[PDB]
Design a protein around this ligand. Structure first.
Ligand code: HEM
Ligand code: HEM
Lengths: 126, 132
């Protein structure tokens, strides 16, 4: 395993004010992000608080694994989980767009949220 | 059910004409290059990427495509392949598709969209591809 390194690998390829500005946009609009709209915050912050050390980070992978096995145990469609993902990436994209940060940093800021969430569901998918 | 087409054609609406084509082209010119293995555990992925990157705009084609994704899922399900191996494939796909786009001299705003389009495209296919 040590999908922790793996995780750092994809994290170390992102500049600092992006990491900060993406983190800071998850921790703000933290509670404003839980979306239910069709016919929780600690999570976003957990994933988007991203650091270096592999105690304060590991619990993130072990937690993700936990929270899938929750979802599967009670038997809920994974494509429902991955859709939630989507609307999340989406709302996060929308939140990124409406900033006055250069499109260059947006460019990273986009891959940074997209990789994370998908990584999440990947490892959340057990 | 059926409005899986509705959603896709709408999302495809959140994007400009060139980006769409740029991305279509991107996948298309490198369809033969992108089935790329570089790791450890255990011409098809061309027309898949192409099917799923034919920026298609027709409830008809969409349905079949949609349903294609569905059928692809079920096959992967019978053999009993872990969902998190496929999402992984999927992650590698857009990751290299990301990179391809980066190394193209486009307008970084054009670029942003280009990113969103490839991201949501695969993930949407992936979402549908789910049945097990
Ligand atoms: C991006 C996708 C999702 C994420 C990140 C997520 C996150 C979580 C987390 C972290 C928990 C932990 C609760 C705990 O530890 O006590 C949880 C529980 C739960 N989730 Fe979600 N969820 C997602 C999608 C969904 C969807 C689409 C549904 C639709 C019904 C759903 C329904 C539930 C339910 C019913 C529980 C209760 C489990 C319990 O008893 O603690 N989840 N979810
Ligand atoms: C994004 C990821 C993937 C996509 C889009 C994909 C797509 C496909 C497609 C289109 C087919 C043939 C269906 C047809 O056109 O008739 C196929 C077959 C197959 N795929 Fe993949 N695949 C993916 C990942 C994987 C992974 C990760 C594995 C295993 C680790 C895998 C194993 C197989 C196997 C074993 C078959 C043949 C099944 C049989 O002969 O019964 N695929 N896949």
């Amino acid at each position: 395993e040590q999908q922790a390194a793996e995780w750092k690998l994809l994290l170390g390829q992102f500049p600092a004010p992006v990491v900060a500005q993406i983190r800071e946009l998850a921790t703000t609009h933290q509670s404003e992000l839980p979306g239910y709209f069709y016919e929780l915050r600690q999570w976003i912050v957990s994933v988007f608080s991203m650091s270096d050390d592999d105690a304060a980070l590991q619990a993130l992978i072990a937690q993700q694994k936990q929270i899938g096995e929750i979802h599967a145990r009670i038997k809920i469609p994974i494509h429902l989980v991955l859709r939630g993902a989507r609307h999340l990436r989406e709302r996060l994209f929308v939140l990124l767009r409406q900033r006055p940060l250069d499109p260059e940093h947006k460019l990273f800021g986009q891959r940074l949220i997209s990789e994370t969430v998908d990584l999440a569901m990947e490892i959340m998918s057990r």
